[PDB]
Ligand binder design. Structure first.
Ligand SMILES: NC(=[NH2+])NCC[C@H]1O[C@@H](n2cnc3c(N)ncnc32)[C@H](O)[C@@H]1O
Ligand SMILES: NC(=[NH2+])NCC[C@H]1O[C@@H](n2cnc3c(N)ncnc32)[C@H](O)[C@@H]1O
Lengths: 322, 319
């Protein structure tokens, strides 16, 4: 983990994510009145680009706390922009860092795949408890989870591939389709893949909301985060499972979304495949509940417990891990 | 290989699958009425190509659980009379006769990574008749110095941050070069002809009919090379790729960046830093493909090179 964020690739991926980086830039600059002349704490600053956005927004003092080796690159970026007097890159975890003062605001890019995989939300909440002033600002302030049933067209392509071999090469391989379905759908993994609007089978349902200012959100991460949903299918298509994505809200309201209906990001969406495709029709009712949990082996690994019911079928469950 | 994705990836590789189909079908005269051994048949698609080419019998040996799907595929094509799927490794399988030909899809990344060449050589010694047909029959290894254009854009990205967000990050290019080039790992990436700095050089050839080739793989495979640069560009390292040659009745399946792309792409051997070169800059050296000391299935590459008047350097790559 320390080895990943000390490398260039993940930071190159995060900054080249134009939708994400421009959203944080605007969400910060939009809060100029709340940041002008104030102090900011950046949890997991990486290269320090968000700390510099806060200084450009008028912040008097920004502390860029970064645990991996990339803090030495953040120091170089900050001096390269002539900002080391206002932006102080501090190495180490935010839980053991020593600030000279409680800060007026906390900014952090903490979200992982499925919102909570390999996430540093607990590190941000730990910094909110220890260093945020009473009534301080949080950027982003909240995260919203969404779910929708899907008919993954790419999966349908990989499933029908074996029925298409004979047209191209003359060898009938349609008997592979039953075997390919079990291999691509029978597993219990969370699949990270980006879908389009054509894949969405019903109206996306918002099933959970996390307000980062709430005390006790820390304990609820251990118990599990999620909620219940109900939707009606747009039309007839094979139900492959569900897509789970998130958005974060900045106090303005600016929204950074990872929805398939909105421009793509590096998070894509988290796909929960059923064991087999399920035929559904227009106005088919799909209800259930989804819980985002830490894996019992690794508290940084996202586990998702799915409970669902399709029409008159009996309620089923499935247990996913990243 | 009991999972579908690797077989789906192999068959979706149109350049690879069509080359094997033609190397088999164009050998109809040599395969008509003859027997074929398919080493690692997987789904059995190559064994059915050999049947259409005219083979009187094909033994499709497969060691993973995918042999049950190949058993179904052969039945679905009405060919279980002359195509027989036999489970287990080719080293312990019992055939009723020696065969006239061997067909096998055995090449891995860098030709010899997660390859089954030894199993094919084991089957050549045990089951192939004298002078029998091998499909493919040989493999040719190539090297060319490269200026990776994708690597240069990944390096130049940090100087472009100030234009969009107003934060200068050009100090990262020095740090990104060490991280993307200072490692000692074989990078599997596909290049184009624009990346090639000099005329590709063949530095080794493997003849699959040769007994004792298996012992030579364990000592190392490769040879020397010499090339002069096309023009001026930063030298980032060397790309290694292969081609397999079928006996004609001569079709070649290439993984060169100058030829249509395959799933093997090319094996990129990056230097620690970029090296400026110009037109007619002579690059000489030697490359050896070896089994890793930790894992004999894992490809290691010893690179020894000299750029112009610079001192001869070496670098030790693994997959
Ligand atoms: N946004 C994400 N999904 N991940 C961002 C992780 C970034 O925050 C850094 N980071 C993670 N946890 C911490 C922590 N407790 N304290 C400081 N930096 C941290 C990590 O080094 C990397 O730069
Ligand atoms: N990896 C490749 N270059 N080709 C695919 C390997 C295929 O050959 C099969 N295979 C590999 N080694 C052997 C062996 N010794 N005997 C039989 N089948 C084998 C493997 O199960 C898979 O279906």
């Amino acid at each position: 983990y320390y080895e990943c964020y000390s490398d260039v690739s993940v930071h190159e991926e995060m900054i080249a994510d134009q939708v994400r980086t421009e959203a944080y830039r605007l969400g910060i600059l939009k809060n100029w009145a709340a940041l002008r002349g104030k102090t900011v704490l950046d949890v997991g600053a990486g290269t320090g680009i968000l700390s510099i956005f806060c200084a450009q927004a008028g912040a008097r003092r920004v502390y860029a706390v970064e645990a991996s080796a990339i803090w030495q690159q953040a120091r170089e970026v900050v001096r390269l922009n002539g900002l080391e007097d206002r932006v102080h890159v501090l190495p180490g975890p935010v839980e053991t860092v020593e600030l000279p003062e409680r800060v007026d605001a906390i900014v952090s890019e903490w979200m992982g795949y499925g919102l909570l995989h390999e996430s540093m939300l607990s590190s941000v909440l730990h910094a909110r408890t220890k260093w945020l002033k009473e009534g301080g600002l949080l950027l982003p302030a909240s995260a919203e989870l969404f779910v929708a049933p899907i008919s993954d067209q790419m999966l349908e392509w990989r499933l029908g591939f074996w029925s298409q071999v004979k047209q191209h090469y003359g060898v009938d391989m349609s008997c592979m389709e039953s075997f390919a379905t079990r291999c691509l759908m029978g597993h219990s993994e969370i699949v990270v893949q980006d879908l389009s609007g054509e894949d969405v089978l019903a109206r996306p349902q918002r099933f959970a909301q996390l307000e980062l200012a709430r005390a006790g959100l820390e304990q609820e991460l251990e118990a599990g985060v999620g909620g219940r949903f109900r939707c009606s299918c747009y039309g007839s298509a094979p139900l492959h499972g569900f897509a789970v994505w998130f958005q974060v809200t900045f106090p303005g309201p600016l929204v950074l979304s990872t929805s398939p209906l909105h421009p793509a990001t590096h998070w894509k969406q988290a796909l929960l495949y059923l064991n087999e495709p399920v035929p559904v029709e227009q106005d088919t009712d799909i209800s259930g509940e989804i819980t985002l949990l830490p894996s019992p082996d690794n508290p940084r690994r996202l586990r998702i417990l799915l409970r669902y019911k399709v029409g008159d079928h009996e309620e089923k469950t499935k247990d996913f891990a990243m």
